[PDB]
Design an enzyme around this catalytic site. Structure first.
Site, PDB file in Angstrom:
ATOM      1  CG  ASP A 190      -1.860  -1.189   1.242  1.00  0.00           C
ATOM      2  OD1 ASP A 190      -2.139  -1.750   0.162  1.00  0.00           O
ATOM      3  OD2 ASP A 190      -2.318  -1.562   2.342  1.00  0.00           O
ATOM      4  CG  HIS A 192      -2.910   3.984   2.113  1.00  0.00           C
ATOM      5  ND1 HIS A 192      -4.256   4.041   1.824  1.00  0.00           N
ATOM      6  CD2 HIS A 192      -2.665   2.715   2.517  1.00  0.00           C
ATOM      7  CE1 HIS A 192      -4.804   2.862   2.054  1.00  0.00           C
ATOM      8  NE2 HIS A 192      -3.861   2.039   2.476  1.00  0.00           N
ATOM      9  CG  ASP A 219      -5.099   0.228  -0.191  1.00  0.00           C
ATOM     10  OD1 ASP A 219      -6.101   0.160  -0.933  1.00  0.00           O
ATOM     11  OD2 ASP A 219      -5.066  -0.268   0.955  1.00  0.00           O
ATOM     12  CG  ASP A 222      -8.839   7.007   0.104  1.00  0.00           C
ATOM     13  OD1 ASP A 222      -9.361   8.140   0.025  1.00  0.00           O
ATOM     14  OD2 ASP A 222      -9.285   6.009  -0.500  1.00  0.00           O
ATOM     15  NE  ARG A 223      -7.245   4.844   6.743  1.00  0.00           N
ATOM     16  CZ  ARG A 223      -7.423   3.591   6.348  1.00  0.00           C
ATOM     17  NH1 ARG A 223      -6.502   2.949   5.649  1.00  0.00           N
ATOM     18  NH2 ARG A 223      -8.555   2.967   6.662  1.00  0.00           N
ATOM     19  CG  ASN A 251      -9.262  -1.498   0.686  1.00  0.00           C
ATOM     20  OD1 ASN A 251      -8.086  -1.529   0.325  1.00  0.00           O
ATOM     21  ND2 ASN A 251      -9.633  -1.057   1.882  1.00  0.00           N
ATOM     22  CG  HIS A 252      -7.925   2.639   0.720  1.00  0.00           C
ATOM     23  ND1 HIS A 252      -8.120   3.674   1.606  1.00  0.00           N
ATOM     24  CD2 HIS A 252      -7.722   1.532   1.474  1.00  0.00           C
ATOM     25  CE1 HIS A 252      -8.035   3.217   2.842  1.00  0.00           C
ATOM     26  NE2 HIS A 252      -7.794   1.919   2.789  1.00  0.00           N
ATOM     27  CG  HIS A 300      -5.637  -4.275  -2.040  1.00  0.00           C
ATOM     28  ND1 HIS A 300      -4.571  -3.815  -1.297  1.00  0.00           N
ATOM     29  CD2 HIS A 300      -6.740  -3.690  -1.517  1.00  0.00           C
ATOM     30  CE1 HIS A 300      -5.009  -2.973  -0.378  1.00  0.00           C
ATOM     31  NE2 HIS A 300      -6.321  -2.878  -0.491  1.00  0.00           N
ATOM     32  NE  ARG A 348      -9.205  -5.203   6.625  1.00  0.00           N
ATOM     33  CZ  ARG A 348      -8.463  -4.104   6.598  1.00  0.00           C
ATOM     34  NH1 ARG A 348      -9.011  -2.901   6.535  1.00  0.00           N
ATOM     35  NH2 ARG A 348      -7.138  -4.213   6.633  1.00  0.00           N
ATOM     36  CG  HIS A 375      -6.709  -5.459   2.877  1.00  0.00           C
ATOM     37  ND1 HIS A 375      -7.354  -4.561   2.055  1.00  0.00           N
ATOM     38  CD2 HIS A 375      -7.621  -5.844   3.801  1.00  0.00           C
ATOM     39  CE1 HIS A 375      -8.601  -4.408   2.465  1.00  0.00           C
ATOM     40  NE2 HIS A 375      -8.789  -5.177   3.523  1.00  0.00           N
TER      41      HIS A 375
END
Lengths: 429, 42, 42
Positions: A190, A192, A219, A222-223, A251-252, A300, A348, A375
């Site tokens: 990831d 991010h 990923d 995000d964040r 997923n992001h 992922h 989750r 992940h």
């Protein structure tokens, strides 16, 4: 029947708090609740023992059950807002704080904490107040640009998105890449939106090219405060090296989470609203998994809840749509492993967890050696589970400038597909 | 700090006899500030 | 209500090409809001 096994774990688990023994306190709290999940007192006592270990996410939900069973439980009510403030988000903590004066009279120290909570929402409110083909010169110039802040021209970004969508739409859901005996390949976890960490990755392991192939396990946004730069640079990398740069859907990369975890806001701040719409359009065409030499299959999310799951089923997947609440793609973007055998409800809240038996069955049925899946955040930057059949790699050091964890990337060789973990560090931005 | 220094420069530049380069941005900032103060959010 | 009406009219006068005769009062209102939004009581 089993009502006696309630207070016997009270004088023991709570006593460990005096001896600073938060670990055994949590372990014994997971026993009284296990044999009595109906007492709000224990659901409140667990909150202090689990909050002092810098674990706020699960305590946030743990403190809610101590309130549902007893709305007069101020002891378990304060700590929910405390965990919310520890996370840093507004509203929930403020609402919890203001929902204490309606149950108590004009008591001392009751409203002071509410005013203190108010005194930060005001701060938050004030905070509110060449030829279109990409070249080595272009990639280096854009890299230096993003290293010196500054947004890319809108026309160039639109052309990049159009070209990357056109290239990605012609790839199958399961990309099959054949690696020669020599010529290693790099797998990254990831990102991010950590562009300054991607800079460290490319400097330590070399720039992507036809000789040093790269592939990232989702990923990219995000964040992070540099999601747009990361994803645009990766799209340029895919454009320049279509056969040596592979991007996997994560997923992001979903609108429901882009709109909540900053990517949509970042794009709307740096560009127009339709520009994020084009992000979403080009995101849905990303492959979900990639297979190397018919031996190493990477994704992922990981494995599925369904028992059949074949590689041909992976190939027959409609990528260009939002992820479902359940099914193949939901687990392909959300699953996690479990140390114990069998399936279980994922922590989750979506998808499920797969055990070592699931991994062994999947590898045996699909004729694969092992699976790589990120992940997740890992302290050492990588993790080996299921006896080596499950590999986790993380390429996001110091995730939210608070974890302070190392990161790693995997070198894979055609002659020996054994993962070669290489670790890097914070590299502050 | 960026927002604070920008707003201070704009207000000081206004209250010294000069003329703004584009009143639309300052007006929008004031409207957003009032909207924040009277609770519309979004 | 009175404060909002006066501030709205003043901003509209600013944004329509006219010249304001007493910019110090406008600056004082902006400063009052800025202190109301950033801590200090007075």
């Amino acid at each position: 029947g089993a009502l006696k096994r309630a207070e016997e774990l009270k004088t023991q688990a709570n006593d460990y708090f005096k001896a600073k023994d938060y670990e055994n306190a949590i372990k014994f709290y997971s026993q009284a609740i296990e044999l009595n999940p109906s007492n709000a007192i224990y659901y409140g006592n667990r909150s202090l023992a689990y909050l002092r270990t810098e674990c706020y996410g699960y305590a946030l939900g743990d403190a809610t059950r101590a309130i549902e069973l007893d709305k007069k439980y101020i002891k378990g009510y304060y700590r929910r807002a405390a965990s919310n403030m520890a996370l840093g988000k507004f509203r929930a903590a403020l609402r919890d704080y203001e929902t204490v004066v309606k149950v108590k009279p004009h008591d001392k120290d009751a409203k002071m904490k509410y005013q203190e909570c108010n005194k930060i929402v005001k701060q938050k409110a004030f905070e509110r107040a060449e030829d279109g083909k990409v070249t080595i010169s272009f990639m280096k110039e854009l890299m230096q640009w993003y290293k010196d802040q500054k947004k890319l021209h809108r026309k160039c970004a639109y052309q990049i998105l159009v070209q990357v969508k056109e290239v990605l739409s012609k790839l199958s859901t399961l990309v099959e890449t054949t690696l020669k005996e020599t010529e290693k390949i790099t797998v990254c976890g990831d990102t991010h939106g950590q562009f300054y960490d991607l800079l460290n990755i490319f400097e330590l392991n070399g720039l992507p090219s036809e000789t040093n192939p790269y592939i990232f396990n989702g990923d990219f946004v995000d964040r992070g405060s540099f999601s747009v730069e990361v994803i645009l640079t990766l799209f340029g990398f895919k454009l320049l090296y279509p056969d040596h740069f592979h991007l996997l859907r994560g997923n992001h990369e979903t609108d429901n989470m882009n709109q909540i975890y900053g990517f949509e806001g970042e794009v709307k701040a740096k560009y127009t609203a339709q520009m994020y719409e084009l992000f979403s359009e080009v995101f849905e065409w990303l492959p979900l998994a990639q297979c190397i030499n018919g031996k190493v299959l990477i994704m992922h999310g990981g494995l599925f809840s369904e028992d059949g799951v074949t590689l041909d089923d992976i190939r027959k997947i409609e990528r260009n749509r939002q992820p479902p609440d359940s099914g193949p793609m939901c687990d392909l973007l959300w699953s996690d492993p479990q140390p114990q055998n069998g399936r279980s409800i994922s922590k989750r809240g979506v998808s499920c967890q797969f055990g070592p038996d699931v991994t062994k069955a999947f590898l045996e049925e699909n004729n694969l050696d092992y699976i790589i899946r990120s992940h997740e955040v890992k302290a050492e930057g990588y993790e080996v589970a299921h006896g080596g059949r499950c590999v986790t790699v993380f390429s996001a050091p110091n995730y939210c400038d608070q974890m302070g964890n190392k990161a790693s990337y995997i070198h894979l060789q055609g002659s020996d597909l054994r993962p070669q973990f290489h670790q890097f560090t914070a590299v502050p931005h | 700090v960026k927002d604070l220094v920008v707003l201070l420069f704009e207000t000081a530049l206004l209250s010294s006899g000069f003329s703004l380069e584009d009143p639309q941005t300052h007006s929008n900032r004031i409207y957003r500030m009032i909207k924040l103060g009277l609770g519309i959010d979004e």
